[PDB]
Amino acid sequence: VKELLEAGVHFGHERKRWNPKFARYIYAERNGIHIIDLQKTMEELERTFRFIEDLAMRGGTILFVGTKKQAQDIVRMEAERAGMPYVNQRWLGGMLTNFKTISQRVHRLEELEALFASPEIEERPKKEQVRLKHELERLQKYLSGFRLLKRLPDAIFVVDPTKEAIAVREARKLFIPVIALADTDSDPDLVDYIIPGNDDAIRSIQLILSRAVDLIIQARGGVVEPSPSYALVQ
Template sequence: MNSSRVDFLRHSGIIATASMEQDLVATIPSSSPEEFSDATAQRLLELGAFYGRTKRRTNPKMKEFVFTTRGEIEIIDVRCIASAMEKAKQFVEEKAKSGAVFLLVATQPIAADAAKEFAAAVQCPFVQKRWIGGTLTNFKTISARVAHYISLKEGFSSGAMEKYTKKERLYKEREMKKLGEILGGLESLHTLPDVVIVVDAVMHHIAVREANRQGIPVVAFSNTDANPDFIDYLVPGNSSSKQSVTWFLEELRDAILRGRKSAPPVEHQDKNTPTATNNDKTPQQEASTEIKI
């Protein structure tokens, strides 16, 4: 085994004793030293992204990503993490080139900071507090609630709420704060997203199922207890680690921004081309005007 590889495994706590090191050397297939001198693999080891769930909690379909087991804890192969991450990055980059709308779902406290930074950089809607059932499968109703939240915000900012009594304003203010905690990140979601990005597919299994039903691709960072059958682009890894989650979102953020930067320029409409009037709306346009956002 390469010495640098042993150092990383020992430093990460996988190797605790000399006997464990000998056992690990015996169980690991021979690999070229270059594979484990790779900067990405080393970084994943340093981040602790390779820690899986206990063997009892691991989904049998995730065994292909498991490198070995130590102390009943599954150790995820960093080569699988890196490979899956590259595929996910290529996918979101291509989608970004075509102007796709991304929706981020990350409600864990450890993902709060990284999720906010991701949403701000990518300028995409996100769910950070709690997933509301029907966000995708009952989109019209959720959109109406978001529109109501926006109208309350605009009413308070413009002073339009002054016409109500003090008690009525207090009630509406409480309603606005409650809606803001749940729906605040969805203000820019005017249509169904083209891609749903999830941190921990098991925790957000309802969001994953809704995306599946709507035919929306799912990119997820999840541990060994996930079911890969419901995820289009699964990046296995320690989804309970703040550093690992931050790495995952930063990698996708950079890929999306690259895709948008390299997107072909939008063709401007010819001045001689007649524009649609209010009386010439398409069925899709008419449907979109039912809910004012």
């Protein structure tokens, strides 16, 4: 787990509309874009990953949040590659904040998987074999990665704070630590363990999330090979 010359991808992103609060993490403007200072990208990674090993080799349940379609897959990949849950489609308001309720959907999903593999699949008209067929299907477009959580995450790994602002707002609210790869357009002060980098561009997100998931197993001791998502980077 490590890397320096990473200008191979991240560094510098977003045009000029920024957020001054993210100026410490900025090196200079070029062609109208802000070029993130990787030196600090490093500093934070260290401090951040250090937080990862910490919760990792300890039983720490991390929740991954990435809705930005520019990284929807890169999320579930590196997420499933760990007992770590994730939200891929759309972050439902109250998942963390109203967890006990948003949970009954998970308690309903699993149960609607029973009927569809029992002596009751063919019972009652299609008036249900359709209503329940869709219910179960939607309950899965969303709760595939959220399915795992038994209790609030020990931390939150967000891809774009500004986009996933609603999740972050809930983390903070619940004193749940907030980890996130944040871009030039976000507010750092809201992220507890920041990874100042290019929050857009699959090649970037994959590199960070990947190494971060490496470190996660390589922290809980499981010796695993490279990432299976380096392909979805095409």
